[PDB]
Design a protein around this nucleic acid. Structure first.
Ligand code: MG
Ligand code: MG
Lengths: 144, 144, 144, 144, 144, 144, 144
RNA sequence: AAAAAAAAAA
RNA sequence: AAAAAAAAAA
RNA sequence: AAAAAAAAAA
RNA sequence: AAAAAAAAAA
RNA sequence: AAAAAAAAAA
RNA sequence: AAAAAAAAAA
RNA sequence: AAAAAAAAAA
RNA sequence: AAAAAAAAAA
RNA sequence: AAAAAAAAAA
RNA sequence: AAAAAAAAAA
RNA sequence: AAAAAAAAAA
RNA sequence: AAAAAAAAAA
RNA sequence: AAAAAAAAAA
RNA sequence: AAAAAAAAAA
């Protein structure tokens, strides 16, 4: 290969964009209480911690969740996800349960193309329920 | 295609990274005086304006430059680029000139693999000379 | 096969080198405190314990890390690695988490060719964060 | 073939560079004392005697060395090279010896792509040891 | 690829040359007056500005010229080149004209093998005529 | 190729070994008196000078020897090797002689698989005889 | 190839001609007034400036014309050609116009074989009309 | 893709 | 169409 | 690549 | 039939 | 196109 | 085996 | 790769 | 090009 | 025969 | 017919 | 990849 | 191996 | 099965 | 015969 700087025969000034889109998998945790659904805000996704504080919208493609602390004594971990949408909330309760008490429960869902519109900080993604006091989510999305 | 949300049969918690790398083409302008070289600082590349303020290092791959204002009366535009490196500056003066007085001059250079190390804000990329008072650069790079 | 000593018809004196290079995977442990990053010194790699005390430089190729003690009560193990470089530090935080509370978390990263320069004892390799009080690293490197 | 001047149908003004790079094999000699290593300075490569006084940086690719005067009485010539690098010196001692007392000893080494960064006059290339009072080097390098 | 220094099994001392030849495209400008031919001296090619001040001879292969300033009001740029040779000057007047008043005129000629002998500083390359006050030349040549 | 750090999806903790074996060609010299056999100790192979002071055992595979100083006036160099073994010494006297007085003599022998057991510092490898006052050995061996 | 003079085994005296024909493209300019056709004389083609002053006849094959100075304010350039012939003039008015105000207009016409007879200095080639005050012609022709 | 100069390689 | 970064997939 | 003009060649 | 110069062409 | 003499070459 | 110089040949 | 001398083998 | 040791990989 | 750099080319 | 040791060979 | 229920399609 | 985002390329 | 380092080989 | 959703399967 070349071991020195070489000239590029540049042409006309190109189309440019200083502030592009970004396809991402974002990991974060939420605290959950027993018997109570937690609504996960979209605003969690915009943070210097993810390099995404310059965005104000996001298109969510899929949501996966894992229990993140141990379950109560005698119990296996479970997590349930209910999709929320601005045009009308769902009533599905997708659920995963652990089969070893020492292991995480997990589940996810995919958002179909027809429901991939933008959401902003004040919108919610899903409701989470669990017997564990924290849940770890990884959300696949398109910042724009 | 699917018109409804569907379940994903998630497995174990994956490897994650909240703060990934990003391959980018960054456009910005510098002011240049007649007969005087301008050293372009790497710090120009870290800005909320580019969504890159969370990074502190960058690996530069190539540099292209265009004149960005009109040249002096009677003259065609020119731009020259001299590569700078922390391990030893170059003395190449890659140059482009316009062939129509109403058109931009342009030139660029590629940095070979052996010289693609990180640079930080206090480092310089290149020296620019021109007969035009501003130069527009587009720098291809890897933020990390 | 031959069962006795046999003659070799040696020729001219060959090129020799009493002190060659060595490609290695080196295992060692570091102690980590909660909430605090630990900077792993390159100096840890030069030791009679690894037969490497005669080297003064090393080129690191990849870094893998495991948690080495159990996590706090109710938690799963995690480990994070942030690459460090003399020419500019990274801000990636590569992370692994366990999915069974009794199991190690692990993660690693590879160093690309353009960043494989020598490091010496006073340099650092990476920052480690964990909720476990010890982390076991295995570093693939070329002593020279 | 053509025996007269002929027209060239020139187009637009091309990209140009008055001060290009140059790939070279540079021959020079150093004086060496018995039992003492000599550090070879990079500055030796920049000289009007090689047409290279306009350069301030160089990328070294390989180093070859020969003994250049006769050895001490009763001895065969030897030469040893230890590579030096700004990011961390090596401890290899690549060695050639003569097999006829009237013949030069020689040896060399190649620098891998990952270590081919620029050096400047104040940097050193390698350490040389020999039982002969002069060593002849040929250095393959890229002036830039 | 190799990431460390490796040995080269050098043989006999090679043929060497500290002061090699160099094939180059040299860009420079000359000032031209209206109605008057400017003889371009070969001495313009030997300069620290081109890294060629150590040469005293050169073999010219081809000459290209562009107008470098705007033409007089109402006119299109033109440039003419007449080849000069120590053994007998030519009377060809190779000519380019612009077809857009804002654009450079250009033309060139090639010297055939039978006329490619050395020239020294006091020799002349060609005569230039133009309606523009500066002409930019690019000369392809073999310094020796 | 990749120009940035990338994640490695590490699994379970691997099998490791901080203190591996090493296959080597070790060069060293012994001083020899006329008419007198010199017994070469295995202990010569364990030294910081070869990076092998952390080993206590070695399996020798082959032995090569060259005369290292000039022979007596009027003579050609010779070297003889007699293999020695803890289970029973040999009486072979493998011998090389020079055919030019200015040139080294050389010879070697290979140890068959059935005799490749470990040796320690107090063991001897071979006896050397020569008309030259130093002999250079290169021993191919497996440190363990 | 041969590097010395060699013999030619010449035969009988050949047919010869001291004054041959010559196929040429001749460039010259004419001044034109607004609203008035200029008749281009064939005599313009016979000149020491073209090396053609020894001819008294020419066979014209084709005529091309370009405007040679800028057009009036607000206008695009145009040029029209009307072919003239000793046996009877044409009334074709072949016309080109510029599509950029800064650019030359051009047009040309070809003379068919049946009309390619000789012309002399007193004959006319074509009529030119333009809104520009000079027109540049290039005439392809056979001097005889 | 082919050619010249410098460098390197089997 | 191939290469690299992030993403997702069989 | 083909054609005209001048040269040269087998 | 191939080369070189000047022209012209797809 | 082959042979001899001088040169050069892979 | 190919090329240049000189010779000779079909 | 093949031949001789000593040994072993299917 | 094949075999050993260490490293890495699908 | 392939790779780098400087030049030239279809 | 293949292998080890010693010698010789292309 | 095949099968059952609901929906749709050529 | 295929698809999407940013990058670079023939 | 492929690559790097050290070793050995035809 | 192919596509979506719920179930079952190798
Ligand atoms: Mg000799
Ligand atoms: Mg225009």
């Amino acid at each position: 290969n070349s071991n020195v700087v070489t000239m590029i025969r540049a042409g006309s000034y190109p189309k440019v964009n200083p502030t592009p889109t970004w396809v991402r998998a974002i990991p974060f945790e939420v605290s959950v209480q027993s018997g109570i659904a937690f609504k996960v805000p979209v605003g969690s996704l915009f943070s210097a911690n993810f390099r995404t504080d310059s965005f104000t919208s996001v298109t969510v493609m899929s949501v996966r969740a894992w229990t993140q602390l141990t379950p109560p004594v005698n119990e296996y971990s479970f997590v349930r996800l209910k999709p929320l949408f601005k045009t009308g909330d769902s009533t599905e309760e997708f659920e995963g349960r652990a089969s070893n008490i020492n292991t995480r429960a997990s589940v996810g869902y995919r958002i179909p193309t027809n429901l991939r519109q933008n959401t902003v900080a004040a919108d919610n993604v899903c409701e989470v329920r669990s017997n564990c006091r924290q849940v770890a989510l990884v959300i696949s999305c398109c910042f724009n």
